[PDB]
Design an enzyme around this catalytic site. Structure first.
Site, PDB file in Angstrom:
ATOM      1  N   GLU A  34       0.706  -1.255  -0.126  1.00 17.39           N
ATOM      2  CA  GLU A  34      -0.009  -0.072  -0.019  1.00 17.39           C
ATOM      3  C   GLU A  34       0.682   1.117  -0.025  1.00 17.39           C
ATOM      4  OE1 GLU A  34      -2.485  -1.220   3.564  1.00 17.39           O
ATOM      5  OE2 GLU A  34      -4.350  -1.573   1.774  1.00 17.39           O
ATOM      6  N   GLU A  38      -4.042 -10.841  -0.349  1.00 17.30           N
ATOM      7  CA  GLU A  38      -4.739 -10.638   1.011  1.00 17.30           C
ATOM      8  C   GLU A  38      -6.158 -11.015   0.613  1.00 17.30           C
ATOM      9  OE1 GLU A  38      -2.272  -6.814   2.546  1.00 17.30           O
ATOM     10  OE2 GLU A  38      -4.671  -6.787   3.228  1.00 17.30           O
TER      11      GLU A  38
END
Ligand SMILES: [Mg+2]
Ligand SMILES: [Mg+2]
Ligand code: NA
Ligand code: NA
Ligand code: NA
Ligand code: NA
Lengths: 409, 204
Positions: free
Chosen positions: A256, A332
């Site tokens: 991220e 994820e």
């Protein structure tokens, strides 16, 4: 914050092994391998020096090579007079995998030719090849099916300090629950972790400590050349430290932090220095030029979520977009916050049906709850804001398949 | 536009198409169709025929076409729908989500077929949604997938019009006949009626 990992003092001789890299390459059916070990020295360079690399399977020595320093010529100015590469042939090697974590022991001796050991370093070696071919991630020539989980380093009483007992407790429970892989969300782990995954057998995604999620836009720092130096160190130093562990099968550039030119530069650095492992990175839409694997987070099985710029396509649809060919493994999925895991079976049916859907890493292993004590001194599980911390994100820190004390959800 | 070559009844299906002695006869069915119809703008894809397995003659004719007429892709479903003789994955009756893994010539779910390792071609079913009798159940499932997957570019329903023939009863009244109604035997009974419309063009 704090001095939260071990502190140690190491004595090395003035003439010493300053680095070493172990590689294992195979023939087409894995019945023959060559172990290549590049060894670098620092200190007093003299012709009497030698390196002996020996490979052991238990108490039996399977192969051994000795050579003086001086690598091949690499350019017009010559070669590395301070390095040597040993090549050991190994017939019918016992291969390493998460299913059967066969390991050999490589001992690296720095010594004078006439027999004096100066010092020795060593590592466990796992003979395995990791390669993506024809859109599939293969381990020893077979396509893996990643039953993974993301695992932060968290203890409800000790914080971010990891201990051997806790790590073993975690690996036992992971394997007991049919996991075969772990993603180091989102930073390199305590060093014993890798040893434990090499020995018990778990595939590992080793991830650089780079996350700039709060910037706006998310790639503001990663696209800025002024931050290339700080980012480079987080990637290069991780590779230098963990490149000989067989458990590490894929390198990740962090998490991220959008997609910036600094990710492209670093992707290429790792592909040059370590061709043995694919590199992945989810930022910027999960299928950018900085990743060998399409590795979205929370992409659904059938449902597209077409956000602008960074859509999260259905994973089955994503694999066949025009021109795409890479394997897809979610970095994820199945966010296990509270009473969750609804729809988990939908992902597994897809993974088994589509060859290029090779699994994913659940988010995540253990709730990040911390212990607090009430007036009567009884312990209780706290979350964001429970320490006066604000702003905070409340219970978003508890997304685990297991409670902080390792009791299963 | 599809060459007049179908050898479905041979065992195995490519018995003639893989035999060089049948290359001449097959070549004429392909070449003379192209010579006749290559100036029509409505023809956008050539087809090497139907249900004749996959034989070396197909490969030879696939390349002939590509060499004389680069303006149109060439497709052919025989031998598993994704052979070297087709520029389009063009299965018949492959389902949307359910695989049918028959040996040698599996019919994968169309969504999965697109992404098999190494595959990159578009997928347009040469036949789907067999409209025999009270049928077309599940038709919407195909359309939702075609709109969601760029490489799923549609298909050709099987088929337009029922092949029934008119017969007349004692009183001279017409009725719709199917296989076996002419004393023909063996026959495949009502399998000749698979259309969206009745033979007289009234819709089903
Ligand atoms: Mg808040
Ligand atoms: Mg019959
Ligand atoms: Na799969
Ligand atoms: Na969280
Ligand atoms: Na489409
Ligand atoms: Na029919």
């Amino acid at each position: 914050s704090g001095i939260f990992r071990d502190v140690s003092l190491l004595h090395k001789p003035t003439t010493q092994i300053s680095d070493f890299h172990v590689a294992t390459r195979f023939n087409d059916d894995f019945s023959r391998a060559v172990l290549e070990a590049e060894v670098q020295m620092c200190g007093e360079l003299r012709d009497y020096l030698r390196v002996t690399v020996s490979l052991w399977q238990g108490e039996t020595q399977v192969a051994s090579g000795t050579a003086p320093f001086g690598g091949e010529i690499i350019d017009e100015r010559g070669g590395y007079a301070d390095r040597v590469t040993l090549r050991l042939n190994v017939e019918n090697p016992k291969l390493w995998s998460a299913e059967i974590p066969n390991l050999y022991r490589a001992v690296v001796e720095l010594h004078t030719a006439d027999g004096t050991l100066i010092e020795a370093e060593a590592c466990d070696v796992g003979f395995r090849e990791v390669r993506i071919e024809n859109g599939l991630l293969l381990l020893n020539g077979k396509p893996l099916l990643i039953r993974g989980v993301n695992r932060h380093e968290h203890h409800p009483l000790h914080g971010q300090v990891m201990d051997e007992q806790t790590m073993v407790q975690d690996i036992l429970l992971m394997k007991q629950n049919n996991f075969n892989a772990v993603r180091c969300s989102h930073y390199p782990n305590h060093p014993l972790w890798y040893t434990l995954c090499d020995r018990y057998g778990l595939y590992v995604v080793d991830e650089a400590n780079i996350e700039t999620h709060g910037m706006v836009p998310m790639n503001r720092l990663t696209d800025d050349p002024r931050w290339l130096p700080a980012m480079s160190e987080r990637v290069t130093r991780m590779v230098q430290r963990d490149r000989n562990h067989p458990s590490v099968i894929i390198w990740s550039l962090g998490n991220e932090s959008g997609h910036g030119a600094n990710h492209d530069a670093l992707y290429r650095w790792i592909k040059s220095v370590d061709p043995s492992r694919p590199v992945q990175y989810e930022g910027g839409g999960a299928d950018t030029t900085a990743t060998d694997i399409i590795c979205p987070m929370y992409a659904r099985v059938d449902e597209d979520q077409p956000f602008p710029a960074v859509p999260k396509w259905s994973i089955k649809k994503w694999l066949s977009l025009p021109g795409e060919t890479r394997p897809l493994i979610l970095c994820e999925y199945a966010h296990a916050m509270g009473n969750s895991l609804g729809g988990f079976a939908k992902y597994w049916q897809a993974f088994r049906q589509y060859p290029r859907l090779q699994g994913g890493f659940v988010w995540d292993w253990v709730d990040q709850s911390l212990i607090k004590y009430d007036e009567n001194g009884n312990p209780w599980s706290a979350y964001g804001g429970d320490f006066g911390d604000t702003p905070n994100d409340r219970q978003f820190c508890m997304n685990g398949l297991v409670f902080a004390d390792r009791t299963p959800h």
